Design a protein around this ligand. Structure first.
Ligand SMILES: CC/C=C\C[C@@H]1O[C@@H]1C/C=C\CCCCCCCC(=O)O
Ligand SMILES: CC/C=C\C[C@@H]1O[C@@H]1C/C=C\CCCCCCCC(=O)O
Ligand SMILES: CC/C=C\C[C@@H]1O[C@@H]1C/C=C\CCCCCCCC(=O)O
Lengths: 190, 180, 180
């Protein structure tokens, strides 16, 4: 009916869905790269301006499927002698093969959880907005994210499998690591 | 009345409009600034014309970061952040994949002026790499676009060229205070 | 009732709220760094105060890329991607033009915390080049902003200065866990 149609349209516009994924640097992509553009003898020291292009692998929440990759850049903002607390400003995207991609913008802080802006998406993520929660499991090679996505159609079930709880021992299945056809997104990004 | 008002408001929030433009590198702005390994940065700025190729609208401006090389496809993946400037109309910002060997879809992160508050996607179609590109924007949540921006689109092809007056920025063939 | 519930939902989705802030470079963050004409990259981070200049909120952080020089107007055009951090309130991200010789409008790409799900535009006004700026955000789609962030705005001018308490980050004059 009229009020149902309207209600449903509004539900979608305001509706939020969660999506968890794992980001893993398997050290096989030459990433990350350090552009030490910021200011002992023949030794690098972090400073504002250092740029860090990067690209890592993306697996689903259940860790049984290779989905794609992250791709983008971080800029070093502040730092000191402590491991914890260095701040980067980042802009990058998550690629999910034929499903589409999600773009993000926001803080990356060494040894701290942060929240990033979801600037939008394509494919099944087209027109989304919201936030991504970034949790570091093993700094800096293993991360976990939960996206909170507003404004899109119900996510397909293969992206909503039971999530493995994030811990240092959490590992992709052997079949996913090897990119077996039964364990990848349609034309998974690589 | 009451349900009319609410419906219309929802109609705007949900509505999507197409907008097509041409991006052309005319070899005059010293763009881009450059291809191998990974992590290379490429700032750039090209000219933007309307879908009908009769009006010079502004420019693109932003950066691409090289991500990987593909030997089989003989191409490179970049991650891009840049904006389309339309003179006094405002601008549209995008973020996402820029890949030398194929078309891609980018995120429309928002806009200003008549594009204020928009969101959606931009389809990037390569005609001749890297000098001639054709984009179709799918823009959600803004008011009806002005007619000047919705003229019959010339189908993308190698013969597609801006009119002489657009190329020379003739007052009859530019956006108000077109971006340069 | 039903259509009241629906009405209030639409109201939020469509509603727009203003938020003004001051950005100030106090020369204590090693900002900015200039890295080479088109292509020059500039990382930066300055301090952010509230519209009333009585409260230190946080910082800005991001990068600008130099696009072009305008000999006539004696200025440069940059393309920027950066964020405003408001301590525990969350943050706002932006993308768009920064031009040394004139005011511009940027895209609000979104936000976190209380700003979660916002979209809109930010109006950038340069007071003192380049160490003091004034912004007004026009934020769509989020719940009512807290009063701390909505105090009476001091009209921007070169003499506009933050209070002694806010400058010294006194607990009475900071956002909760203000970003630093
Ligand atoms: C938000 C980006 C997602 C993961 C982090 C991305 O991989 C980039 C890390 C960026 C900054 C951290 C700086 C430490 C980099 C040291 C790398 C050492 C190594 O090669 O393992
Ligand atoms: C266009 C900005 C995005 C990506 C650039 C990508 O690195 C590729 C560009 C390569 C060459 C630019 C060629 C166009 C310049 C016109 C001068 C003609 C010429 O010398 O070939
Ligand atoms: C959107 C820009 C926001 C804040 C401005 C940011 O600091 C960047 C200004 C851009 C260009 C100025 C380039 C020359 C500045 C050198 C002087 C810096 C200083 O006084 O510490």
């Amino acid at each position: 009916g009229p009020l149902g149609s309207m209600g449903n349209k509004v539900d979608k516009l305001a509706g939020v869905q969660e999506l968890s994924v794992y980001e893993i640097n398997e050290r096989d992509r030459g990433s990350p790269v350090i552009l030490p553009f910021g200011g002992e003898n023949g030794a690098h020291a972090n400073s504002l301006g250092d740029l860090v292009p990067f690209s890592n692998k993306v697996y689903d929440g259940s860790l049984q499927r290779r989905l794609g990759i992250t791709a983008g850049i971080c800029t070093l903002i502040s730092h000191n002698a402590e491991k914890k607390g260095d701040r980067y400003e980042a802009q990058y995207s998550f690629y999910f093969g034929d499903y589409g991609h999600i773009s993000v913008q926001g803080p990356y802080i060494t040894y701290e959880d942060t929240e990033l802006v979801v600037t939008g998406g394509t494919g099944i993520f087209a027109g989304c907005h919201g936030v991504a929660k970034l949790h570091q499991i093993i700094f800096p090679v293993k991360l976990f994210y939960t996206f909170y996505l507003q404004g899109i159609k119900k996510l397909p079930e293969e992206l909503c499998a039971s999530v493995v709880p994030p811990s240092p021992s959490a590992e992709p299945s052997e079949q996913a690591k090897k990119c077996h056809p039964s364990s990848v997104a349609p034309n998974f990004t690589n």
